[PDB]
Design a protein around this ligand. Structure first.
Ligand SMILES: NC(=O)c1cc2ccccc2n1-c1cccc(C(F)(F)F)c1
Ligand SMILES: [Ca+2]
Ligand SMILES: [Cl-]
Ligand SMILES: [Cl-]
Length: 123
């Protein structure tokens, strides 16, 4: 869930998870448009991952799952079911993605009216 999303992102990366609560066109609840930067691409990818999780019958915003932070890396488990494993994989992925990015302050609280109606496709 959101608790583990924040936790995993904090574990791996250099910055507060507050940094991604409203950033670019995709970091934040929902999102649409051309991603502005690497960070925004990570968030688009995560949005897709969560969409897939929901299509599989999971609740990616709420379900609790166990994980470990070891040397600023996320280890997923123990998993009681497939939803817990899918969710941790999604969050592990974005955490790794964001940890490799430079922050562009100008995209924090970016205006939604500059974000295009359509978005790039999900893998
Ligand atoms: N892919 C995202 O949008 C996203 C990425 C991210 C990273 C750290 C902390 C939060 C983060 N979010 C986010 C922010 C607000 C609401 C939601 C929710 F999952 F509820 F949609 C998700
Ligand atoms: Ca989003
Ligand atoms: Cl910070
Ligand atoms: Cl939603």
């Amino acid at each position: 869930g959101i608790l583990e999303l924040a936790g995993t992102v904090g574990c791996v990366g250099p910055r507060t998870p507050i940094a991604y609560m409203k950033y670019g066109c995709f970091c934040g609840l929902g999102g649409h448009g051309q991603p502005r930067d690497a960070i925004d691409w990570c968030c688009h990818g995560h949005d897709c991952c969560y969409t897939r999780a929901e299509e599989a019958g999971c609740s990616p915003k709420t379900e609790r799952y166990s994980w470990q932070c070891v040397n600023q890396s996320v280890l997923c488990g123990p998993a009681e079911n497939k939803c817990q494993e899918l969710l941790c994989k999604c969050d592990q992925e974005i955490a790794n993605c964001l940890a490799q990015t430079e922050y562009n302050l100008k995209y924090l609280f970016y205006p939604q009216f500059l974000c295009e109606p359509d978005s790039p496709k999900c893998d």
